[PDB]
Amino acid sequence: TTFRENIAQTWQQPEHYDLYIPAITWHARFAERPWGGGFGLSRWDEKGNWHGLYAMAFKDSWNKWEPIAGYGWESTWRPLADENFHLGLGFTAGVTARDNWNYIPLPVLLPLASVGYGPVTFQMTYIPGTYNNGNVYFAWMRFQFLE
Numbered sequence: 001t002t003f004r005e006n007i008a009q010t011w012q013q014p015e016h017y018d019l020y021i022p023a024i025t026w027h028a029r030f031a032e033r034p035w036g037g038g039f040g041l042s043r044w045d046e047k048g049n050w051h052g053l054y055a056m057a058f059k060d061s062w063n064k065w066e067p068i069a070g071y072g073w074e075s076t077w078r079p080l081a082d083e084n085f086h087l088g089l090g091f092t093a094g095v096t097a098r099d100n101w102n103y104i105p106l107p108v109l110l111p112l113a114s115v116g117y118g119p120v121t122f123q124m125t126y127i128p129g130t131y132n133n134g135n136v137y138f139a140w141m142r143f144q145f146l147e
């Protein structure tokens with residue numbers, strides 16, 4: 001209900017747009033940047049928490065277009081004298097699709113964490129081993145635009 005309200009508000013009244021550029025991927029516990037990118041809309045809410053709606057493109061194992069689009073949210077902390085430093089933890093609820101399965105929309109739910117300074121943020125997820133080519137951390141820079 002509040003989740004439905006929140007997504008919409010980002011949809012209807014975004015405050016910024018963002019560019020997402022993949023940065024690094026590594027295997028959880030150690031078991032060129034990754035191809036792709038995305039863009040999105042976002043806002044900081046009155047709790048100072050982050051809401052985003054994004055669309056990204058990657059390349060799958062067959063070198064085929066692999067989209068993901070979704071909503072991201074992070075509970076955000078600004079613990080230092082310079083309020084521009086921000087750390088966050090939340091999740092993303094999204095949809096992806098694969099050439100092998102005729103691009104049928106499939107639900108994805110993943111964790112999110114980030115550390116940034118003002119409009120420049122290192123943000124990441126853990127892709128669980130339940131997914132093909134999973135059990136990896138995947139991180140990107142997010143660049144926030146508009147004042």
Ligand SMILES: CCCCCCCCCCCC[N+](C)(C)[O-]
Nearest residue numbers: 017039040041053054055069070
């Ligand atoms: C299902 C969620 C899809 C939401 C994706 C929204 C992305 C639109 C961002 C357009 C940004 C406009 N631009 C390029 C001038 O920044």
Ligand SMILES: CCCCCCCCCCCC[N+](C)(C)[O-]
Nearest residue numbers: 052054058059060072092125138
């Ligand atoms: C708020 C943005 C959330 C973006 C979540 C990205 C999840 C997909 C991770 C990329 C996977 C691409 N690849 C080729 C490694 O499978």
Ligand SMILES: CCCCCCCCCCCC[N+](C)(C)[O-]
Nearest residue numbers: 075076077087088089113114115
């Ligand atoms: C990207 C590196 C990992 C960052 C992990 C940061 C997690 C700190 C928790 C931030 C939220 C704090 N709190 C309780 C006010 O929400």
